[PDB]
Amino acid sequence: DKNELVQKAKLAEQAERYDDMAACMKSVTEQGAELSNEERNLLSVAYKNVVGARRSSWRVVSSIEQKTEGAEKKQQMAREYREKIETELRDICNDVLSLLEKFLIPNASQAESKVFYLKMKGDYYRYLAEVAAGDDKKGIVDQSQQAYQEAFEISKKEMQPTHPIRLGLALNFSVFYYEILNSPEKACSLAKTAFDEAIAELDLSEESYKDSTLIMQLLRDNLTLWTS
């Protein structure tokens, strides 16, 4: 089966063995069939954990590298370690991105799916951007932007303002603006617009209601943080 591979994925997950988890979901996806919701959520959880360890490590090693502007033999080591880490992080981003292009985005048969995967493309190009160089960065940044912007176009047309997926896109695209493009006014109004539109369209099913409000809280937390 491949139902088997999904069951293995869930095991891995319960064992907090995210590399295993990611390897299962990679092969499920590569079986070529559109993923169920559950599967989509397993794939994404898997790769978030795999990539988040490298991001988190990268920030530690970068901080150290720069806080030792005086030592040298150390700066040489930290730097080389940062870049070993960056290599892992890139290969990961590349596998996810390749998976999105080859399988997930083309077969996405619902708008809810398409948006989900497009946002995901934006996120992964975003992590590629955070660790970009001085001769690749604008290329990667525009890729991130374009994925978010198409996802954003579709969700605005196809989905309700309280849609947790539509809301989550707005949270991540606004973060893209603040951190990647250094456009805080832009990040702010993207987040504010998405919060207010959800406030207006309050009349939101019972299931989603619970993730919606939360994300709205996160939107407002970023707004207030970014003020002053």
């Binding site: 901080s63 996120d123 949270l171 991540n172 951190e179 993730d211 939360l214 994300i215 996160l218």
Partner: peptide, 10 residues
């Protein structure tokens, strides 16, 4: 250290 305040898996 710094956490980009994007979407969590809850």
């Amino acid at each position: 250290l710094y956490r980009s305040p994007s979407m969590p898996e809850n």
